[PDB]
């Protein structure tokens, strides 16, 4: 039958109760064959986080001290869990071995990866599934990059040959056989990898929210869930940037046609958003997929006599922005003028020196600054390229009496970006949603 592969995040394994939710989800569908765990999430704001505490042990070892006070809390964390779940195992055998390894000079990467490992070994028992260490099945190369062709070969050999298997998350083996952890991707990528390697049908990604929403729920009331979403589509929304699964995490799935379903461990019935492939997603005829804005931006408007004739005028301008840790969002231009739209935190403090260097090299006539802009990105495949689709957005914004301060449509076929006064941000986003939902 179908081969679904599941990952559960920190919030899904914060304590014993969540684990019961995970067991529930797993034996509620026999096709949930493969399970990838994160390390226990914080259960309250001021709670300590395991992985961090692990690193800290390694710090004691670098510093030539015991870390017995620290490792108490770890074992304490993990013994309460396997106790409350009343599981037939001796977790100390695992903890005790980890402690030793660390104080006998284990790498940081080894140290911090044990949060996922321990959850792995617990879950294999608790869910009656074969435990398969990551270090056996995921491999890196000489530079430090993910060796694809090998890992999958191994996955097919070791993982798809099991009926039900747990596979810990956040790490694999380095070229030299020693434990290497991912730098970007967390337990999500390892989930994607496994799916790729097993040729899974679905990769369920279990979190604490029932998919993604069409808009910010603080702003719009009771906003629809995004039934379906392409990768390119999602990427556009990710940047602007709604709290959504990052590109880093899903590159292995992307090559093959493996759909991801974002799902909620605390409301499993709730259907997900279903992140499809570009050529695997259909195209709803003239419609919005999502609306995602970010506040706090400032434009640097640069009027210059025949700016259009001379070459390298702009090249000089962002050679200067490269000279600091400051990226630009957009470079809207006119006939003999050009702007730079730049986020405020990215500009914080540095602003002043930058205006001077451009004045030296480029030699404009006017150089003003106008802050208090926000950006609203409205995204969808079906607006690519529908008639009057930007006009529909401007009609909306006209009805709410809100002055437009930037338009970009042209950067991307599935995306119109509108820039407006920061006061009007929430008003705009509202207006555009209503425009497309009855």
Binding site for ligand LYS (CB under 6 A): 307-308, 311-315, 327-329, 333-335, 338
115 labelled ligand-binding: no
**Chosen residue from 275, 377, 428, 432 binding a second copy by CB under 8 A:** 377
Is the Cβ of residue 39 or residue 417 nearer to ligand LYS in the bound state? 417
Task: Please tell me the distance from the alpha carbon of residue 236 to that of residue 378, in angstroms, as a whole number.
Answer: 9
**From the list a second copy, ligand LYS, ligand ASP, none, partner contacted by residue 84 (C-beta under 5 to 8 A by kind):** none
Among all chains, which residue has been given the structure tokens 């434009």?
Answer: 299
Task: Please tell me the distance from the alpha carbon of residue 235 to that of residue 230, in angstroms, as a whole number.
Answer: 8
- Smallest gap from Cβ 120 to ligand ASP, in A, equals 10
Under rule CB under 8 A, residue 145 binds a second copy: no
Q: 3-state DSSP call for residue 56?
A: helix
Is the Cβ of residue 47 or residue 322 nearer to ligand ASP in the bound state? 47
How far, in Å, are 225, 306, 406, 423 from residue 116 at the CA level? 30, 60, 46, 44
Task: Please tell me the distance from the alpha carbon of residue 245 to that of residue 254, in angstroms, as a whole number.
Answer: 13
- Smallest gap from Cβ 183 to ligand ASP, in A, equals 10
User: How many CA atoms lie within 13 Å of 23's alpha carbon, on the beta-carbon side?
Assistant: 15
9 labelled ligand-binding: yes
Is the Cβ of residue 199 or residue 386 nearer to a second copy in the bound state? 386
Under rule CB under 6 A, residue 265 binds ligand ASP: no
Window 239-278: residues binding a second copy (CB under 8 A): 239, 247-248
Window 26-55: residues binding ligand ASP (CB under 6 A): 38-39, 51
Query: Residue-wise over 112-128: b if at least 16 C-beta within 10 A, else e?
Result: bbbbbbbbbbbbbbbbe
Nearest by Cα to 170 from 157, 188, 156: 188
The H-or-E segment that residue 232 falls in is helix 231-240
**From the list ligand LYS, ligand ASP, a second copy, none, partner contacted by residue 416 (C-beta under 5 to 8 A by kind):** a second copy
- Cβ neighbours of residue 64 under 8 Å, at least 6 residues apart? none
- Smallest gap from Cβ 425 to ligand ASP, in A, equals 31
Nearest by Cα to 189 from 116, 278, 284, 90: 116
**Chosen residue from 4, 6, 10, 244 binding ligand ASP by CB under 6 A:** 10
CA dihedral 320, 325, 328, 329 (to 10 degrees): 170
Binding letters toward a second copy, positions 279-318, x by CB under 8 A = --------------------x-x-x-xx-xxxxx-xxx-x
Is the Cβ of residue 216 or residue 247 nearer to a second copy in the bound state? 247
8 labelled ligand-binding: yes
Identify each DSSP E strand in 108-238 by its residue range. Answer: 130-131, 165-166, 171-173, 179-181, 202-207, 228-230
Window 394-423: residues binding a second copy (CB under 8 A): 394-395, 397-398, 401-413, 415-417, 419
**From the list ligand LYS, ligand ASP, a second copy, none, partner contacted by residue 207 (C-beta under 5 to 8 A by kind):** none
Window 139-178: residues binding ligand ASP (CB under 6 A): 170
10 labelled ligand-binding: yes
- Report residue 180 as tokens: 């290497």
6 labelled ligand-binding: no
Under rule CB under 8 A, residue 226 binds a second copy: no
Window 166-225: residues binding a second copy (CB under 8 A): none
**Chosen residue from 109, 116, 133, 233 binding ligand ASP by CB under 6 A:** 116
**Chosen residue from 330, 357, 371, 422 binding a second copy by CB under 8 A:** 330
CB-CB contact of 109 with 179 (8 Å) = yes
**From the list a second copy, ligand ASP, ligand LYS, none, partner contacted by residue 208 (C-beta under 5 to 8 A by kind):** none
Write the DSSP assignment of 277-321 as a string of letters.
-TTTS---TT---EEEEEEEEEEEEEE-TTTTTSTTHHHHHHHHH
Residue numbers at the binding site for ligand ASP (CB under 6 A): 9-10, 38-39, 51, 112, 116, 170, 186-187
Binding-site annotation: residue ranges for ATP: 7-10, 207-208, 218
């Amino acid at each position: 039958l179908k081969i679904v592969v599941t990952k559960f995040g920190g919030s899904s394994l914060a304590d014993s109760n969540q684990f019961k939710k995970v067991k529930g989800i797993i034996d509620s569908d026999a096709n949930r064959k493969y399970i990838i765990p994160s390390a226990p999430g914080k259960r309250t704001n001021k709670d300590y986080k395991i992985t961090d505490l692990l690193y800290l042990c390694n710090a004691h070892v670098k510093n030539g001290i015991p870390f017995d006070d620290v490792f108490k809390l770890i074992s304490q964390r993990y013994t309460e869990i396997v106790s409350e779940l009343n599981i037939d195992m001796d977790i100390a055998y695992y903890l005790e071995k980890v402690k030793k390894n660390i104080e006998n000079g284990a790498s940081s990467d080894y140290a911090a990866s044990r949060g996922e490992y321990l959850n792995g070994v617990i879950l294999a028992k608790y869910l009656n599934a074969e435990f398969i260490d990551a270090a056996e099945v995921i491999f890196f190369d000489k530079s430090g990059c993910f060796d694809e062709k090998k890992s999958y070969e191994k996955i097919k050999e070791k993982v798809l040959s099991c009926n039900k298997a747990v596979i810990p998350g956040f790490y694999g083996s380095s070229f030299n056989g020693d434990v290497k952890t991912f730098s970007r991707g967390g337990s999500d990528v390892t989930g994607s990898i496994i799916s790729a390697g097993v040729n899974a049908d679905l990769y369920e990604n279990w979190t604490d929210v029932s998919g993604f929403l069409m808009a910010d729920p603080r702003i719009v009331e009771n906003p629809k869930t995004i039934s379906k979403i392409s990768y390119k589509e999602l990427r556009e929304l990710s940047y602007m940037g709604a709290t959504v699964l990052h590109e880093e995490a899903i590159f292995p799935v992307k090559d093959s046609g493996i759909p991801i379903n974002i799902k909620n461990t605390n409301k499993p019935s709730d259907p997900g958003t279903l992140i499809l492939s570009d050529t695997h997603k259909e195209i709803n005829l003239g419609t919005i997929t999502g609306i995602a804005g970010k506040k706090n931006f400032t434009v640097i408007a640069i009027e210059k006599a025949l700016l259009n004739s001379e070459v390298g005028f702009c090249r000089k301008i962002l050679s200067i922005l490269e000279m600091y840790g400051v990226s630009f969002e957009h470079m809207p231009s006119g006939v003999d003028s050009v702007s730079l739209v730049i986020e405020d935190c990215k500009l914080d403090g540095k602003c002043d020196k930058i205006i001077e260097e451009i004045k030296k090299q480029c030699n404009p006539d006017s150089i003003e600054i106008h802050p208090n802009m926000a950006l609203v990105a409205t995204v969808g495949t079906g607006m690519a390229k529908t008639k009057g689709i930007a006009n529909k957005i401007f009609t909306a914004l006209s009805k709410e009496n809100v002055n437009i301060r930037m338009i970009d449509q042209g950067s991307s076929e599935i995306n119109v970006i509108v820039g407006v006064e920061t006061v009007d941000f929430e008003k705009a986003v509202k207006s555009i949603y209503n425009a497309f939902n009855e």
